[PDB]
Design an enzyme around this catalytic site. Structure first.
Site, PDB file in Angstrom:
ATOM      1  CG  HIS A 169      -1.552   5.494  -0.657  1.00 59.44           C
ATOM      2  ND1 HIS A 169      -2.158   5.820   0.537  1.00 59.44           N
ATOM      3  CD2 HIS A 169      -2.508   4.906  -1.414  1.00 59.44           C
ATOM      4  CE1 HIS A 169      -3.425   5.448   0.502  1.00 59.44           C
ATOM      5  NE2 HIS A 169      -3.663   4.890  -0.671  1.00 59.44           N
ATOM      6  CG  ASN A 223      -0.895   8.448   2.838  1.00 56.98           C
ATOM      7  OD1 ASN A 223      -0.961   7.286   2.443  1.00 56.98           O
ATOM      8  ND2 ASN A 223      -0.464   9.443   2.073  1.00 56.98           N
ATOM      9  N   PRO A 244      -7.550   7.627  -4.078  1.00 62.99           N
ATOM     10  CG  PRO A 244      -7.640   5.400  -4.743  1.00 62.99           C
ATOM     11  CD  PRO A 244      -6.708   6.599  -4.713  1.00 62.99           C
ATOM     12  NE  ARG A 263      -4.085   1.911   2.269  1.00 65.41           N
ATOM     13  CZ  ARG A 263      -4.253   3.140   2.745  1.00 65.41           C
ATOM     14  NH1 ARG A 263      -3.258   3.754   3.372  1.00 65.41           N
ATOM     15  NH2 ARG A 263      -5.432   3.743   2.626  1.00 65.41           N
ATOM     16  CB  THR A 283      -6.646 -16.645   1.703  1.00 66.67           C
ATOM     17  OG1 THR A 283      -6.795 -15.923   0.476  1.00 66.67           O
ATOM     18  CG2 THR A 283      -7.103 -18.085   1.495  1.00 66.67           C
ATOM     19  CG  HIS A 323      -8.286  -4.032  -1.373  1.00 68.11           C
ATOM     20  ND1 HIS A 323      -9.282  -3.153  -1.740  1.00 68.11           N
ATOM     21  CD2 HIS A 323      -7.242  -3.269  -0.972  1.00 68.11           C
ATOM     22  CE1 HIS A 323      -8.859  -1.913  -1.569  1.00 68.11           C
ATOM     23  NE2 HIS A 323      -7.623  -1.955  -1.102  1.00 68.11           N
ATOM     24  CG  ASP A 382       7.894  11.207  -6.150  1.00 70.40           C
ATOM     25  OD1 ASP A 382       7.184  10.537  -5.365  1.00 70.40           O
ATOM     26  OD2 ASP A 382       7.642  12.395  -6.433  1.00 70.40           O
ATOM     27  CB  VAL A 437       1.109  11.435  -4.494  1.00 71.38           C
ATOM     28  CG1 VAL A 437       1.207  12.935  -4.213  1.00 71.38           C
ATOM     29  CG2 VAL A 437      -0.192  10.881  -3.912  1.00 71.38           C
TER      30      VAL A 437
END
Ligand code: HEM
Ligand SMILES: [Ca+2]
Ligand SMILES: [Ca+2]
Length: 306
Positions: A42, A70, A139, A38, A225, A170, A50, A46
């Protein structure tokens, strides 16, 4: 152009150092693989991958860690620091934090039982963080399918396959009760639950997330799972058992004509899903990277070199 062999001469053991760090952390925190994936997601959404998300607060710019997507959600930063320090010891001033996080994401997926592949490398680190951009670009679980599609297209991922395959992230990880309360008790101001949520699963979720209960309580994204990276996430969707609104919409939205066939295809074949996930992951990892002499090779991923 980014290339998988970027460090084969300068730091041939980078992937192994990254893997070892994750294996060690997983023994005490079985959620870290998911958390790391994740973080990479993220980072890429953005200003590209980087390592901008890794930067802490400064008096000139706010950290992305305080973005709505976040704050009180993103985690694993100390683990990234740990592997960075190890890599710096093995190969000083060689591997960028942006690349390090990309490798960490791939290794996390593989360690969880997912596909194994060599990610393109050669990304460099940003000279600033982008909080406002993070608030605009990340999102949210309450997005409609058109909004989810808009979010992906905004950062450079035009394909429905990008959205459907990457949502497969997910297949493991946790989610706070806070993000599904509406689906359970009052969806879209109806005072009723989300009709696309399987009623048997609805009761289970209500038991984990009661009204006026602990909104920070964690629930598994994949009821089949919870910690294994596999295609079970899609089987859940077909049974109306996606956890958050954005999950179930891939299969149930009135705008899902293009996403439904992808969901079924990934639910029907692990190979089909794994192939699509690797393809989508590399595409996401190719979003506006700084290369060549642009940006720097950050020594401490939390601060820009001075
Ligand atoms: C399609 C839109 C997406 C939305 C709206 C979304 C939303 C969220 C939310 C609400 C959480 C729960 C965070 C928390 O409660 O702490 C989360 C967790 C997570 N997301 Fe997504 N996500 C999306 C796409 C993705 C993608 C593209 C990936 C990666 C390929 C991803 C990987 C993860 C993982 C693995 C977790 C669990 C992290 C952990 O347990 O620490 N997500 N996401
Ligand atoms: Ca970034
Ligand atoms: Ca799973």
């Amino acid at each position: 152009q980014l290339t998988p062999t970027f460090y084969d001469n300068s730091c041939p053991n980078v992937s192994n150092i990254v893997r070892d760090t994750i294996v060690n952390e997983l023994r005490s925190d079985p959620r870290i693989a998911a958390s790391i994936l994740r973080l990479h997601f993220h980072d890429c959404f953005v200003n590209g991958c980087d390592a901008s998300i890794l930067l802490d607060n400064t008096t000139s710019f706010r950290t992305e860690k305080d973005a709505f997507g976040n704050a009180n959600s993103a985690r694993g930063f100390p683990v990234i620091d740990r592997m960075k320090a190890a890599v710096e010891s093995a190969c000083p001033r060689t591997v960028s934090c942006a690349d390090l996080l990309t490798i960490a994401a791939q290794q996390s997926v593989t360690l969880a039982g997912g596909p194994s592949w060599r990610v393109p490398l050669g990304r460099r680190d940003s000279l600033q963080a982008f909080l406002d951009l993070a608030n605009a670009n990340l999102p949210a679980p309450f997005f409609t399918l058109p909004q989810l599609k808009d979010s992906f297209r905004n950062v450079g991922l035009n394909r429905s396959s990008d959205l459907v395959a990457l949502s497969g992230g997910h297949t493991f990880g946790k989610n706070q009760c806070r993000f599904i309360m509406d689906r359970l008790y009052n969806f879209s101001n109806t005072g009723l639950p989300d009709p696309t949520l399987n009623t048997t699963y609805l009761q289970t979720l209500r038991g984990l997330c009661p009204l006026n209960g602990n909104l920070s309580a964690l629930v598994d994204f994949d009821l089949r799972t919870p910690t294994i990276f596999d295609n079970k996430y899609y089987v859940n969707l077909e049974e109306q058992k996606g956890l958050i609104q954005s999950d179930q919409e891939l299969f149930s939205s009135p705008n899902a004509t293009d996403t439904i066939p992808l969901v079924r295809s990934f639910a029907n074949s692990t190979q089909t899903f794994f192939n699509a996930f690797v393809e989508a992951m590399d595409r996401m990892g190719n979003i506006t990277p700084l290369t060549g002499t642009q940006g720097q090779i950050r020594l401490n991923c939390r601060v820009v070199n001075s």
